[PDB]
Coordinates of N, CA and C and ligand atoms in Angstrom, one line a residue:
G1 N 5.7 -27.6 -23.4 CA 4.4 -26.8 -23.0 C 3.3 -27.0 -24.0
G2 N 3.3 -26.1 -25.1 CA 2.3 -26.2 -26.1 C 1.7 -24.8 -26.3
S3 N 1.2 -24.2 -25.3 CA 0.7 -22.7 -25.3 C 1.5 -21.7 -24.9
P4 N 1.4 -20.5 -25.2 CA 2.2 -19.4 -24.6 C 1.5 -18.9 -23.4
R5 N 2.2 -18.1 -22.5 CA 1.6 -17.8 -21.0 C 2.0 -16.2 -20.9
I6 N 1.4 -15.2 -21.5 CA 1.6 -14.0 -21.1 C 0.3 -12.9 -21.2
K7 N 0.0 -12.3 -20.2 CA -1.2 -11.4 -20.3 C -1.0 -10.0 -19.5
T8 N -0.5 -9.1 -20.0 CA -0.3 -7.9 -19.3 C -1.1 -6.7 -20.1
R9 N -1.3 -5.5 -19.5 CA -1.9 -4.5 -20.0 C -0.8 -3.1 -20.1
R10 N -0.5 -2.5 -21.1 CA 0.5 -1.2 -21.0 C -0.2 -0.3 -22.2
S11 N 0.2 0.9 -21.9 CA -0.3 2.0 -22.8 C 1.0 2.7 -23.4
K12 N 1.9 3.2 -22.6 CA 3.1 3.9 -23.3 C 4.3 3.1 -23.0
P13 N 5.2 3.4 -23.7 CA 6.5 2.6 -23.5 C 7.4 3.4 -22.4
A14 N 8.2 2.6 -21.8 CA 9.1 3.2 -20.8 C 10.5 3.6 -21.3
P15 N 11.1 4.7 -21.0 CA 12.3 5.2 -21.4 C 13.7 4.3 -20.9
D16 N 14.7 4.3 -21.6 CA 15.7 3.5 -21.2 C 16.1 3.3 -19.6
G17 N 15.7 4.6 -19.0 CA 16.0 4.6 -17.6 C 15.3 3.4 -16.8
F18 N 14.1 3.2 -17.3 CA 13.5 2.0 -16.6 C 14.3 0.7 -16.5
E19 N 15.3 0.4 -17.3 CA 16.1 -0.8 -17.3 C 17.1 -0.8 -16.0
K20 N 17.3 0.5 -15.5 CA 18.0 0.5 -14.1 C 17.3 -0.2 -13.1
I21 N 15.8 0.1 -13.1 CA 15.0 -0.6 -12.2 C 14.0 -1.7 -12.7
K22 N 14.6 -2.3 -13.7 CA 13.5 -3.5 -14.3 C 13.5 -4.8 -13.5
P23 N 14.8 -5.2 -13.2 CA 14.8 -6.7 -12.4 C 14.2 -6.5 -11.2
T24 N 14.5 -5.3 -10.2 CA 14.0 -5.1 -8.9 C 12.5 -5.4 -8.8
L25 N 11.8 -4.6 -9.7 CA 10.2 -4.6 -9.7 C 9.8 -6.2 -10.1
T26 N 10.6 -6.8 -11.0 CA 10.2 -8.2 -11.2 C 10.1 -9.0 -10.0
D27 N 11.1 -8.9 -9.2 CA 11.1 -9.5 -7.8 C 10.0 -9.7 -7.1
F28 N 9.2 -8.4 -7.1 CA 7.9 -8.5 -6.3 C 7.0 -9.4 -6.8
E29 N 6.9 -9.7 -8.1 CA 6.0 -10.6 -8.7 C 6.2 -12.2 -8.0
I30 N 7.4 -12.4 -7.7 CA 7.6 -13.7 -7.0 C 7.2 -13.8 -5.6
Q31 N 7.4 -12.6 -4.8 CA 6.8 -12.5 -3.6 C 5.4 -12.4 -3.5
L32 N 4.9 -11.6 -4.3 CA 3.4 -11.5 -4.4 C 2.7 -12.9 -5.0
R33 N 3.4 -13.6 -5.9 CA 3.0 -14.9 -6.3 C 2.8 -15.9 -5.2
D34 N 3.6 -15.9 -4.1 CA 3.3 -16.9 -2.9 C 2.0 -16.4 -2.3
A35 N 1.9 -15.1 -2.1 CA 0.4 -14.9 -1.3 C -0.7 -15.0 -2.5
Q36 N -0.6 -14.5 -3.6 CA -1.4 -14.8 -4.6 C -1.8 -16.1 -4.8
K37 N -0.9 -17.0 -4.9 CA -0.9 -18.4 -5.0 C -1.8 -19.2 -3.7
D38 N -1.7 -18.8 -2.6 CA -2.3 -19.3 -1.5 C -3.8 -19.1 -1.8
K39 N -4.3 -17.8 -2.2 CA -5.7 -17.5 -2.5 C -6.2 -18.6 -3.3
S40 N -5.6 -19.1 -4.3 CA -6.3 -20.1 -5.2 C -5.8 -21.5 -4.8
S41 N -4.7 -21.8 -4.2 CA -4.3 -23.1 -3.8 C -4.0 -23.1 -2.2
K42 N -4.5 -24.2 -1.5 CA -4.2 -24.2 -0.1 C -4.8 -22.8 0.5
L43 N -6.0 -22.9 1.2 CA -6.7 -21.7 1.7 C -7.6 -22.1 2.9
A44 N -6.9 -22.9 4.0 CA -7.7 -23.2 5.3 C -7.3 -22.3 6.5
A45 N -6.0 -22.3 6.7 CA -5.4 -21.4 8.0 C -4.7 -20.2 7.4
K46 N -4.3 -19.3 8.4 CA -3.5 -18.1 8.1 C -3.8 -17.7 6.5
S47 N -5.0 -16.8 6.5 CA -5.4 -16.4 5.1 C -5.4 -14.9 5.2
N48 N -5.9 -14.1 5.9 CA -5.9 -12.7 6.1 C -4.5 -12.3 5.9
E49 N -3.7 -12.9 6.8 CA -2.1 -12.4 7.0 C -1.4 -12.6 5.6
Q50 N -1.7 -13.6 4.8 CA -1.3 -13.6 3.6 C -1.6 -12.5 2.5
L51 N -2.8 -11.9 2.5 CA -3.3 -10.7 1.7 C -2.4 -9.5 2.4
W52 N -2.2 -9.4 3.6 CA -1.5 -8.2 4.1 C -0.3 -8.2 3.7
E53 N 0.5 -9.3 3.5 CA 1.8 -9.3 3.0 C 1.8 -8.7 1.5
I54 N 0.8 -8.9 0.9 CA 0.7 -8.3 -0.6 C 0.5 -6.7 -0.6
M55 N -0.6 -6.3 0.1 CA -0.7 -4.9 0.3 C 0.4 -4.3 0.9
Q56 N 1.1 -5.0 1.7 CA 2.3 -4.4 2.5 C 3.5 -4.3 1.4
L57 N 3.6 -5.2 0.5 CA 4.7 -5.1 -0.7 C 4.5 -3.7 -1.2
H58 N 3.4 -3.1 -1.4 CA 3.1 -1.9 -2.0 C 4.2 -0.8 -1.5
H59 N 4.1 -0.7 -0.1 CA 5.0 0.2 0.6 C 6.5 0.2 0.0
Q60 N 7.1 -1.2 0.0 CA 8.5 -1.1 -0.3 C 8.6 -0.8 -2.0
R61 N 7.4 -0.8 -2.7 CA 7.6 -0.2 -4.1 C 7.4 1.3 -4.1
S62 N 6.7 2.0 -3.2 CA 6.9 3.3 -3.3 C 8.1 3.8 -2.6
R63 N 8.6 3.0 -1.6 CA 10.0 3.4 -1.1 C 11.2 3.2 -2.0
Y64 N 10.9 2.2 -2.8 CA 12.1 2.0 -4.0 C 12.1 3.1 -5.0
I65 N 11.0 3.5 -5.6 CA 10.7 4.5 -6.6 C 11.1 5.9 -5.7
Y66 N 10.5 6.1 -4.5 CA 10.7 7.4 -3.9 C 12.2 7.3 -3.3
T67 N 12.8 6.4 -3.0 CA 14.2 6.4 -2.6 C 15.1 6.9 -3.8
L68 N 14.7 6.3 -4.9 CA 15.6 6.8 -6.2 C 15.2 8.1 -6.8
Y69 N 13.9 8.3 -6.8 CA 13.4 9.7 -7.4 C 13.5 10.8 -6.2
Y70 N 13.3 10.7 -5.2 CA 13.5 11.9 -4.0 C 14.8 11.9 -3.5
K71 N 15.7 10.9 -3.3 CA 16.8 11.0 -2.7 C 18.1 10.7 -3.7
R72 N 18.0 9.4 -4.3 CA 19.3 9.3 -5.2 C 19.2 10.1 -6.3
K73 N 18.0 10.6 -6.9 CA 18.0 11.5 -8.1 C 18.5 10.8 -9.2
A74 N 18.4 9.6 -9.6 CA 18.9 8.8 -10.7 C 17.8 8.6 -11.7
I75 N 16.7 9.3 -11.8 CA 15.6 9.0 -12.8 C 15.0 10.4 -13.2
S76 N 14.0 10.3 -14.3 CA 13.5 11.3 -14.7 C 12.0 11.5 -14.5
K77 N 11.4 12.4 -14.1 CA 9.8 12.6 -13.9 C 9.1 11.9 -15.1
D78 N 9.6 11.8 -16.3 CA 8.9 10.9 -17.2 C 8.9 9.4 -16.9
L79 N 10.0 8.9 -16.5 CA 9.9 7.4 -16.0 C 9.3 7.3 -14.8
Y80 N 9.5 8.2 -13.9 CA 8.9 8.1 -12.5 C 7.2 8.4 -12.7
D81 N 6.8 9.1 -13.7 CA 5.4 9.4 -13.9 C 4.9 8.1 -14.6
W82 N 5.6 7.4 -15.6 CA 5.3 6.3 -16.3 C 5.1 5.1 -15.3
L83 N 5.9 5.0 -14.3 CA 5.7 4.0 -13.2 C 4.4 4.3 -12.5
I84 N 4.3 5.4 -12.1 CA 2.9 5.7 -11.2 C 1.7 5.3 -12.1
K85 N 1.8 5.5 -13.3 CA 0.6 5.4 -14.1 C 0.5 3.8 -14.8
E86 N 1.7 2.9 -14.8 CA 1.6 1.7 -15.1 C 1.7 0.6 -13.8
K87 N 1.3 1.0 -12.8 CA 1.1 0.2 -11.6 C 2.5 -0.1 -10.9
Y88 N 3.1 0.9 -10.2 CA 4.4 0.6 -9.6 C 4.5 1.2 -8.3
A89 N 4.3 2.7 -8.1 CA 4.4 3.1 -6.8 C 3.0 4.0 -6.5
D90 N 2.8 4.7 -5.3 CA 1.5 5.3 -5.2 C 1.9 7.0 -4.9
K91 N 1.3 7.7 -5.9 CA 1.5 9.1 -5.3 C 0.6 9.6 -4.2
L92 N -0.8 9.1 -4.2 CA -1.6 9.7 -3.2 C -1.0 9.0 -1.7
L93 N -0.4 8.0 -1.7 CA 0.1 7.5 -0.3 C 1.4 8.4 -0.1
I94 N 2.3 8.5 -0.9 CA 3.5 9.3 -0.8 C 3.3 10.7 -0.5
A95 N 2.0 11.1 -0.9 CA 1.4 12.4 -0.7 C 1.1 12.5 0.8
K96 N 0.1 11.5 1.1 CA -0.3 11.6 2.6 C 0.8 11.7 3.6
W97 N 1.9 10.9 3.3 CA 3.1 10.9 4.2 C 3.8 12.4 4.1
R98 N 3.8 13.0 3.1 CA 4.5 14.3 3.0 C 3.5 15.2 3.6
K99 N 2.3 15.3 3.6 CA 1.4 16.2 4.3 C 1.9 16.3 5.7
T100 N 1.0 17.2 6.6 CA 1.5 17.4 8.1 C 0.3 16.5 8.9
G101 N 0.5 15.8 9.9 CA -0.4 15.2 10.6 C -0.4 13.5 10.3
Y102 N 0.3 13.2 9.2 CA 0.2 11.6 8.8 C 1.6 10.9 9.3
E103 N 1.5 10.7 10.6 CA 2.8 10.1 11.2 C 2.6 8.6 11.2
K104 N 1.3 8.3 11.8 CA 1.0 6.8 11.9 C -0.1 6.4 10.7
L105 N 0.4 6.2 9.6 CA -0.3 5.9 8.3 C 0.1 4.6 7.8
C106 N -0.8 3.5 7.5 CA -0.2 2.4 7.0 C -0.9 2.2 5.4
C107 N -2.1 2.6 5.1 CA -2.5 2.3 3.6 C -3.2 3.6 3.2
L108 N -3.8 3.5 2.0 CA -4.7 4.7 1.5 C -6.1 4.7 1.7
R109 N -6.7 3.5 1.7 CA -8.0 3.2 2.1 C -8.3 2.5 3.6
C110 N -7.3 2.8 4.4 CA -7.3 2.4 5.7 C -7.1 3.6 6.9
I111 N -7.3 4.8 6.3 CA -7.2 5.9 7.2 C -8.0 7.2 6.9
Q112 N -9.2 7.0 6.0 CA -9.8 8.1 5.6 C -11.3 8.3 6.0
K113 N -11.7 9.5 6.5 CA -13.0 9.5 6.8 C -13.8 10.8 6.2
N114 N -15.2 10.7 6.1 CA -15.9 12.0 5.5 C -17.0 12.4 6.4
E115 N -17.6 13.6 6.1 CA -18.6 14.2 7.0 C -19.7 14.8 5.9
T116 N -20.2 14.1 4.9 CA -21.3 14.5 4.1 C -22.3 13.8 4.1
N117 N -22.2 12.5 3.6 CA -23.4 11.4 3.5 C -22.8 10.2 4.5
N118 N -21.8 9.5 4.3 CA -21.5 8.4 5.1 C -20.0 8.4 5.6
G119 N -19.5 7.5 6.3 CA -18.2 7.5 6.9 C -17.4 6.1 6.2
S120 N -16.5 6.4 5.7 CA -15.6 5.1 5.0 C -14.1 5.3 5.5
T121 N -14.1 4.8 6.8 CA -12.5 4.8 7.3 C -12.4 3.5 8.1
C122 N -11.3 3.3 8.4 CA -10.7 2.1 9.1 C -10.7 2.1 10.6
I123 N -10.7 1.1 11.4 CA -10.6 1.3 12.9 C -9.1 1.6 13.3
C124 N -8.3 0.9 12.6 CA -6.7 1.2 13.2 C -6.5 2.7 13.1
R125 N -7.0 3.4 12.2 CA -6.6 4.9 12.2 C -7.1 5.4 13.4
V126 N -8.3 4.9 14.1 CA -8.7 5.6 15.3 C -7.8 5.1 16.7
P127 N -7.2 6.0 17.3 CA -6.5 5.6 18.4 C -7.3 4.9 19.5
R128 N -6.8 4.4 20.6 CA -7.5 3.6 21.5 C -8.5 4.6 22.5
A129 N -7.8 5.8 22.8 CA -8.5 6.8 23.6 C -9.9 7.2 22.8
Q130 N -9.8 7.4 21.4 CA -11.0 7.6 20.8 C -11.9 6.4 20.8
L131 N -11.5 5.2 20.7 CA -12.3 4.0 20.6 C -12.9 3.9 21.9
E132 N -12.1 4.0 23.1 CA -12.7 3.9 24.5 C -13.9 4.6 24.7
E133 N -13.9 6.0 24.2 CA -15.2 7.0 24.3 C -16.3 6.3 23.6
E134 N -16.3 5.5 22.7 CA -17.2 5.2 22.0 C -18.1 4.0 22.9
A135 N -17.4 3.3 23.6 CA -17.8 2.2 24.7 C -18.7 3.1 25.6
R136 N -18.0 4.0 26.3 CA -18.7 4.9 27.5 C -20.1 5.4 26.7
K137 N -20.1 5.8 25.5 CA -21.2 6.5 25.0 C -22.3 5.7 24.6
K138 N -21.9 4.3 24.4 CA -23.1 3.4 24.3 C -23.0 2.4 25.4
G139 N -22.8 2.7 26.6 CA -22.9 1.9 27.8 C -22.3 0.5 27.4
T140 N -21.2 0.5 26.9 CA -20.5 -0.9 26.6 C -19.0 -0.9 26.7
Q141 N -18.1 -1.8 26.2 CA -16.8 -1.8 26.3 C -16.0 -1.9 24.8
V142 N -14.8 -1.9 24.7 CA -14.1 -2.2 23.4 C -12.6 -2.4 23.6
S143 N -12.1 -2.9 22.5 CA -10.7 -3.3 22.7 C -10.0 -3.7 21.4
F144 N -9.6 -2.8 20.5 CA -9.1 -3.2 19.3 C -7.5 -3.5 19.1
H145 N -6.9 -3.8 18.2 CA -5.5 -4.2 18.1 C -4.9 -3.8 16.8
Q146 N -5.4 -4.9 15.9 CA -5.0 -4.7 14.5 C -6.2 -4.9 13.6
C147 N -6.3 -4.1 12.3 CA -7.6 -4.3 11.6 C -7.5 -5.5 10.5
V148 N -8.4 -6.0 10.1 CA -8.5 -7.0 9.1 C -8.1 -6.4 7.6
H149 N -8.3 -5.2 7.2 CA -7.9 -4.7 5.9 C -6.4 -5.3 5.7
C150 N -5.4 -4.7 6.5 CA -3.9 -5.0 6.3 C -3.3 -5.7 7.3
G151 N -2.3 -5.6 7.4 CA -1.5 -6.1 8.7 C -0.9 -5.0 9.6
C152 N -1.9 -4.2 10.1 CA -1.4 -3.1 10.8 C -1.9 -3.2 12.4
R153 N -1.1 -2.8 13.4 CA -1.5 -3.1 14.8 C -2.0 -1.8 15.4
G154 N -2.9 -1.2 14.5 CA -3.6 0.0 15.2 C -2.8 1.1 15.0
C155 N -2.9 1.8 13.9 CA -2.1 3.0 13.8 C -2.8 4.5 14.2
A156 N -2.4 5.2 14.9 CA -3.1 6.5 15.2 C -2.0 7.8 15.5
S157 N -2.2 8.7 14.6 CA -1.4 9.8 14.8 C -1.7 10.9 15.7
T158 N -3.1 11.2 15.9 CA -3.6 12.2 16.7 C -3.4 11.8 18.1
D159 N -3.6 10.5 18.5 CA -3.2 9.9 19.9 C -2.6 8.7 19.9
Ligands
ZN201 ZN1 -3.8 -0.5 6.7
ZN202 ZN1 -6.6 -0.3 8.9
ZN203 ZN1 -3.2 1.2 10.1

């Protein structure tokens, strides 16, 4: 080779407990590397689907840490918190699922709306009955299925 190849950012060290889940997290880099490599090499057909597999991998990460910290109980809040702060799982996403009314949720920035200045939500969060009303209100038609943000087929819990 000739030059080294390592560039990561860390703040606090992880407790020995991290060794129990050290190789499983490394496997995600090989899967993310396939979609991450397509963005720089070979990028003509099938592109949005490649990124959906990357943001979708985040769900398996929270389920892996959630399955061992909330069910297996084989880890301590310090390691579980060190992972949430060093890019491992997502507390805001696991919190939205624990809340009430979040049965059809796919991501964190793909199902949120505001009522103060502007609205930043995704169409997949809105069911078809709500989307159909918009067409009748503007004298037009409508027909959504999946959103471009991730690989979701329209998720709506209200309807
Ligand atoms: Zn989504
Ligand atoms: Zn969406
Ligand atoms: Zn969705």
